[PDB]
Write a protein that binds this DNA or RNA. Sequence first.
DNA 1: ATCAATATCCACCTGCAGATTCTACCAAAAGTGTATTTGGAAACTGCTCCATCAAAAGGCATGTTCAGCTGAATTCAGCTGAACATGCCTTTTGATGGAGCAGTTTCCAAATACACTTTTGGTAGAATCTGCAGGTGGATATTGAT
DNA 2: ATCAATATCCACCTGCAGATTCTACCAAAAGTGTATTTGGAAACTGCTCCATCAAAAGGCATGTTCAGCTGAATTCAGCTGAACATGCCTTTTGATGGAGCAGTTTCCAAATACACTTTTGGTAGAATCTGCAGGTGGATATTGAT
Lengths: 79, 87, 99, 94, 99, 98, 106, 109
Amino acid sequence: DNIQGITKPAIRRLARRGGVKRISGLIYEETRGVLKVFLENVIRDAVTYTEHAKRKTVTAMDVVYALKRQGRTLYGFGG
Amino acid sequence: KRHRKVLRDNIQGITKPAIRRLARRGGVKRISGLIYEETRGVLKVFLENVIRDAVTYTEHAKRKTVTAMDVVYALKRQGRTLYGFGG
Amino acid sequence: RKRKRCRKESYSIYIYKVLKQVHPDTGISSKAMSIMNSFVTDIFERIASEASRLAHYNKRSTITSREIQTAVRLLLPGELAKHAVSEGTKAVTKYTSSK
Amino acid sequence: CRKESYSIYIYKVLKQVHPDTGISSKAMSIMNSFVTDIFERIASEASRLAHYNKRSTITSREIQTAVRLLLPGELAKHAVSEGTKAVTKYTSSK
Amino acid sequence: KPHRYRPGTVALREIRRYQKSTELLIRKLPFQRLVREIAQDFKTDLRFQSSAVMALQEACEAYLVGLFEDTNLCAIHAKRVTIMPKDIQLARRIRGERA
Amino acid sequence: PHRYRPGTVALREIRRYQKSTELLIRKLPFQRLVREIAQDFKTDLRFQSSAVMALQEACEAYLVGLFEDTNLCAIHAKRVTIMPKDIQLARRIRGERA
Amino acid sequence: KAKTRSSRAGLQFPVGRVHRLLRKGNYSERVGAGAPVYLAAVLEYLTAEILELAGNAARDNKKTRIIPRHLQLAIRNDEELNKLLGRVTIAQGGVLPNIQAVLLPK
Amino acid sequence: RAKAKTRSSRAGLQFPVGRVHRLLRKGNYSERVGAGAPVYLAAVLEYLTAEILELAGNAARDNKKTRIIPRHLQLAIRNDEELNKLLGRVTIAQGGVLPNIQAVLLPKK
DNA sequence: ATCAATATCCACCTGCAGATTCTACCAAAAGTGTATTTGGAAACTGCTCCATCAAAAGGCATGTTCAGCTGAATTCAGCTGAACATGCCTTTTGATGGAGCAGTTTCCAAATACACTTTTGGTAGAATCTGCAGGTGGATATTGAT
DNA sequence: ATCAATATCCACCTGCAGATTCTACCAAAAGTGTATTTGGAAACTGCTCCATCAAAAGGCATGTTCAGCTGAATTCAGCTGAACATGCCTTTTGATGGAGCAGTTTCCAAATACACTTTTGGTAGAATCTGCAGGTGGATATTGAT
Ligand SMILES: [Cl-]
Ligand SMILES: [Cl-]
Ligand SMILES: [Cl-]
Ligand SMILES: [Cl-]
Ligand SMILES: [Cl-]
Ligand SMILES: [Mn+2]
Ligand SMILES: [Mn+2]
Ligand SMILES: [Mn+2]
Ligand SMILES: [Mn+2]
Ligand SMILES: [Mn+2]
Ligand SMILES: [Mn+2]
Ligand SMILES: [Mn+2]
Ligand SMILES: [Mn+2]
Ligand SMILES: [Mn+2]
Ligand SMILES: [Mn+2]
Ligand SMILES: [Mn+2]
Ligand SMILES: [Mn+2]
Ligand SMILES: [Mn+2]
Ligand SMILES: [Mn+2]
Ligand SMILES: [Mn+2]
Ligand SMILES: [Mn+2]
Ligand SMILES: [Mn+2]
Ligand SMILES: [Mn+2]
Ligand SMILES: [Mn+2]
């Protein structure tokens, strides 16, 4: 499974940047579930932008538009 | 030519038992004594943000009356959509 | 003396029609109708807007049934979108058969 | 397939405020996204304003109200100022 | 002899009472008074459509009833039954509001 | 043998990664991940490298702020250790759940 | 010989008006002929799905007439409508009955 | 005949008054755009760019950098009460977070 | 396990307010016919993007130790909830005066519409420069022991 | 707090590759100049809809007393999660080759835009219909004390 590729030391760095000092063991599987969910919502919308344009490549703008729909605006790849 | 009574301090009109009724609908069983002033603080901020925009919509339309639609448009900007008044 | 008159437009007559189709015996209060009217106008804007974006995104001057459909896929939860996409396609083919 | 950014205009504004400082390419694209972003926020609100009042035209008056609705208090105030400064100086030239 | 409900019992009855209902919970003249005071600080000599104060009241009460759900979860997360300002504060910040 | 007290490396690690701005999930398992998920939607989809880089930026920020939020919830319950129930509460209050 | 487009598409919703509204709202320079039809259908399907559940909610509370409480119950108890309307307030709707278990005696 | 002078120049702006006019037109925001609208808008846009780059630049000099990088943008925006709210739901690629350690987590001594 | 005290449910009635049905003008679809776009269907590129391959490198999985954190159990002071008298002030309802929506008309200041004519933003090699990978060498923090 | 002892960070320097800034062009926007439609500010003006005021009722906010139970504090053990060293392995990174595409250009059938002229669906009051708000009283549950 590829979700398990998102490893414990990576999830712990994110937590360190997010300012967490101590981390419970059940967190990493919890985190993967949430990351999983996030990626789906965003990609579902992005591919839907792709299919509409009759393209086969997902563009940066496709992800930017999806992220805007989801209320999470991203700067630096088009707006 | 005539005047109204000065409107001042009306946030205290939002009484404690009303704040207690709202929390009950919100599922609160027990309430700290300091809650009531906090709520008033939060409500006031809410109302200002919402009304400011409502009035801005009024100033723009060159009106003197605030309409339900002004308030519904304000509420939409602010991300809290209201159904049932022109919604 | 002379007199002046006005006119408003809502989805009320349609909402009532659809109400009678599903619950023939049931009625609807004004506040309830007004809420329903608010709902149509809302969904109408969300779809029209997203459709407008899709068109502008692909350097297109025209909103077609297809922009509407994609928009619908983006705004509705699956199985509300699955049914909606279905009902709408039914309407366009039916509309195209009798010209 | 020609593109378009606000880069040269941002670079121009960058050099007016800090002559000595430059901007990485990634930073520039972030700014380009910012300008594009706010532009849409203001235009939309202006479009909304016009339609609400059964109006066909977006005027500076619409931008100004839109700017009021979208910008935080001290930022609305300076922006509203700067924009009027820009329209007046534009009318000056006859 | 005199009868007394243990503390919490009347609270639970009230929670049930008011969740079953849909009436406005702030009294209507003091709320109106509050709104006219605030609105008059932005612009003077305004008037209000009735539906506009009622819209504002519905919107407010909805906001607070819901903040209280979120506040209530926060007290509980901290192994308490009593809501306090830090619960509202925590809730308002996670939500994305402030001060 | 020298040993730092538990918590001392952590406060050091927090400082490192807040002071910095690099991506924190390593790029290939992630790129790999994004590609699996997408084909739950279509096949022979293709990705601009910048598109996967965009998704990765979107993810880490999301998770980092959720982690800020989870952390406040943990401290609120007078703990220093975040747990699933903290992530649960933060996502509920945000509106992503229940 | 006149034949309303709503009739042609088998819809209650006014395909004609929905056409007018797409135009005078400026979403694009031109509007395709199928767009208001598809849209009017989706509007009609969604008001149908909601009124269905709200009617069910009125009958279970022995009422003939739908009131805003029934809209609110129908909406907040349906997983997908609740998502669609997650940021919507229904005037006079109330909340769903819910008491955290931690709060009950026993 | 006569001698051309760009609307940006007439308004004393660096930002493209002409381009902002075209974009308002081709975005379908209204049937018509007044001549004052793009001027006003372009000014407003320029001003916000100035305010950000001002503060983002001050931060680059404090890291001894000639070049503004996203970190300085992120520093500038998230440290200014108002810019931070305007951009409250915006992610800045390669921005990082503001250094902040919740005090409870620091040692007692 | 019973009892007294409460509160909540839940069905019965009925004029009346609020919802339905109905009427008749008329605004706005619909039908026609002419005038414009436009989004394709085929034909062509250059260019990103996959698909592999294989070094070398940090970075990750492991397992053991032990610090110290989370949660449990107890204790207690004081705060908040329940209950009741009292009386203020909201709620209703109603009449009236009057501002100011909203409906209309008429007319310019202002926008749109071509036709041309510069002028600029974008683009692509060539020509300078700033971080950057690294290296210290030194300070700065930290831990376990007196 | 001092002392000593690892361990880790972090400023002072420094040549060089990967980027930024600089040069030299051009199609495509932007600007001008002239000729015309036209949206919407103004000036009324009818008339809803709002702002007060007030009387009279009786619903609730208030203030007070008091004890149940909650929150805060302490103490403590067991068990989880941090830190660390070791060692294997996944990930980076660095070109290469070739196909599967998005991006253009250009051509016409097909689709959409308009303007009038009917023709009908939708709306506003008016005239009927009618749930059910509100006011009850008996049962059925619930709570808390002997
Ligand atoms: Cl989400
Ligand atoms: Cl070395
Ligand atoms: Cl000693
Ligand atoms: Cl002409
Ligand atoms: Cl306790
Ligand atoms: Mn049915
Ligand atoms: Mn009693
Ligand atoms: Mn203008
Ligand atoms: Mn009547
Ligand atoms: Mn080797
Ligand atoms: Mn009193
Ligand atoms: Mn040039
Ligand atoms: Mn140039
Ligand atoms: Mn360096
Ligand atoms: Mn280095
Ligand atoms: Mn010793
Ligand atoms: Mn080089
Ligand atoms: Mn003419
Ligand atoms: Mn006119
Ligand atoms: Mn007493
Ligand atoms: Mn006691
Ligand atoms: Mn121990
Ligand atoms: Mn008819
Ligand atoms: Mn009743």
